[model samples]
Target: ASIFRCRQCGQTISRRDWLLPMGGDHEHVVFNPAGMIFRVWCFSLAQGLRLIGAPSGEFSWFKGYDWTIALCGQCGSHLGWHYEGGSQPQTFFGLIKDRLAEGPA
Candidate 1:
């Protein structure tokens, strides 16, 4: 339903590459209740996400892997994190839905 950019500086980070169609489909929307109610729409994969550094630390949302922060290539805004699986080594991106700005006018 949207395109995303860095909320900090309005730099483009990703297009509508991972948005699921409205149907009987079921995609996981992750939640973070650390301070406030936040939701992240999980995807099978995504493009246009630039991994910051090596994957580090455990992700509370995901269990089988550690996550690395991702940032906007143009503005350096932390948009999301990438999960690196343990032995299987699968990777995915979890981007914040609220941080995304709507498409261009």
Candidate 2:
């Protein structure tokens, strides 16, 4: 099955539980003023991604009631943001696409 891993340390972030389909039209790579890029990946809750941080924001790209930082459970690298605390049917983790690599698990 296809797998997604942490680019920095090759940590197994998730297995074949989710599919990396095309992202939304509104979801595109963002760039800071200094030329840094920020790309997002929508991850499934079944992947067992670890999020550590208080959800204190009202607005995010994922439109979360609150947001938290997602980290790799094995390597402790910053993966992305876990958007939650809303009445929405589904919650998504906006992980940085640049920080991940795809391969066979």
Candidate 3:
């Protein structure tokens, strides 16, 4: 007795919950970099380089802790500054102050 199905919303998404690893077919079209769009990704390179971001709003002023962070959103094209390696690529001191943006004003 073995039957499983979820061919895109067939609603049998289970193989003991069928976490992930199902059908796969892929073709990718990609074009980027016109002016500015930056996304240096790292939530956890397996729990490393925790959080880093910049570009808050119109001339965002988050200066005091005094290092640097910028990957802006609000009409700034986009920004990036993710250099989390081991010297620091997984951090958590002060981050997660709103994190969802689509750029280009």
Candidate 4:
């Protein structure tokens, strides 16, 4: 297993989570309505994130899912988004690859 930490604060984010395949892949390159591109990885769980803002489905990258901003619990750095209200597994984290540091668990 590997450990993923917040790049800004070094706070551990994901310890036991593994890459989860969504839409036939574990990672996705997404283009948002704002013209920003993000390389996001899906995971079953991320215990180190604090979700903020009301979940919104507007312009959602994942159709039928609502997302809330995900921040690092320790330093409040924006890490990604937490998704819910879609399908099986019900909830998951879509973490930005560039915002995390990976190391041995």
Candidate 5:
């Protein structure tokens, strides 16, 4: 099993969560509406995250999904986005690649 931790505060974000394939892939490099590029890994769940902001579908990277900002529960660092209202799995997480580190649980 692999453990993923927050880069800033070393909080455990995901403990062996299933990597979900989105758009036919497990990893994606996406450009946001602000032109910021992000490398994200899709996961079925992340227990150590705190979701903030109202879910929005505007500028959604995934069609038919709404997204909310996900923060590290321990230190409140921006970790990723939580997505829901999709046809499959109901919900999932898109964690920032650089914002997380692989380490001991």
Candidate 6:
């Protein structure tokens, strides 16, 4: 499969090393909720690098860090707020399909 691309900045993020996403024949992707972006690896992992005491690979490509993720471009603000807890990333909390589109657009 082809590597994911960012929606806002149009940067090419590298492939992921983790297990293939759940479900069959379905393409998994991450997007910045705040921004209309589709790549999370840009500021998501780069910001974490500042906190992890590893600043060597801040703007460049690394081995484990995903480089294809998106960020919040609406305000150019916080890029990885949802994963700030420092625990397991990417949790699921399903909401009613009808209610999802009822709120902010």
Tens digit per residue, CA lDDT, model 2, 1-105: 378788888887764456333344323465545676897766654243577868857445544347788888777888877767765434656678778888886
Cα lDDT tens digits, model 3, 6-100, are 22222221122212111131111222345433322222211112224442323211222232353232232112222222232222122221232
Model 4 Cα lDDT, one tens digit per residue, 1-105: 389999999988885457789988869999887899999999888877899978999888887789999999999999999999999778888999999999887
lDDT of each: 0.62, 0.66, 0.24, 0.88, 0.88, 0.26
Where does candidate 6 stray beyond 4 Å? 14-82, 89-105
Q: Candidate 5 lDDT, tens digit per residue, 1-105? A: 389889999888885557888878879999987889999999988878899978999888888899999999999998989999988877899999899988765
Task: Summarize candidate 6's per-residue lDDT along 1-105 as a digit string, tens digits.
Answer: 433323334333222332222233113334333544333222222211112222232332222232222233332322332222222333211111111111111
TM-score, cand. 1:
0.63
Q: Show pairs that collide, candidate 1.
A: none
Candidate order (TM-score): 4, 5, 2, 1, 6, 3
Pairs of colliding residues, candidate 5:
none
Using Cα atoms with residue i matched to residue i, what is each candidate's TM-score against the true structure? 0.63, 0.72, 0.18, 0.92, 0.92, 0.24
Q: Write model 1 residue lDDT over 38-100, tens digit each, in one string.
A: 456554455556787777664456667688877776677667777776433265566777776
Q: What is the Cα-based lDDT of residue 84 in candidate 1? A: 71
Q: Rank the candidates by lDDT, best first.
A: 4, 5, 2, 1, 6, 3
Each candidate: RMSD: 4.4, 3.4, 17.3, 1.4, 1.4, 13.1
The global Cα lDDT (0 to 1) of model 5 is: 0.88
- Model 3, residue 6: displacement in angstroms? 32
Root mean square deviation (Cα) for candidate 2: 3.4
User: How much lDDT does candidate 1 score?
Assistant: 0.62
Q: After superposition, how far is residue 88 of candidate 6 from its true place, in Å?
A: 3.5
Error of 3 at 87 (Å): 3.9
Which portions of model 5 miss their true places by more than 4 Å? none
Write down the TM-score for model 2: 0.72
What is candidate 6's CA lDDT for residue 43? 21
Q: In every candidate, how many clashes are there? A: 0, 0, 11, 0, 0, 5
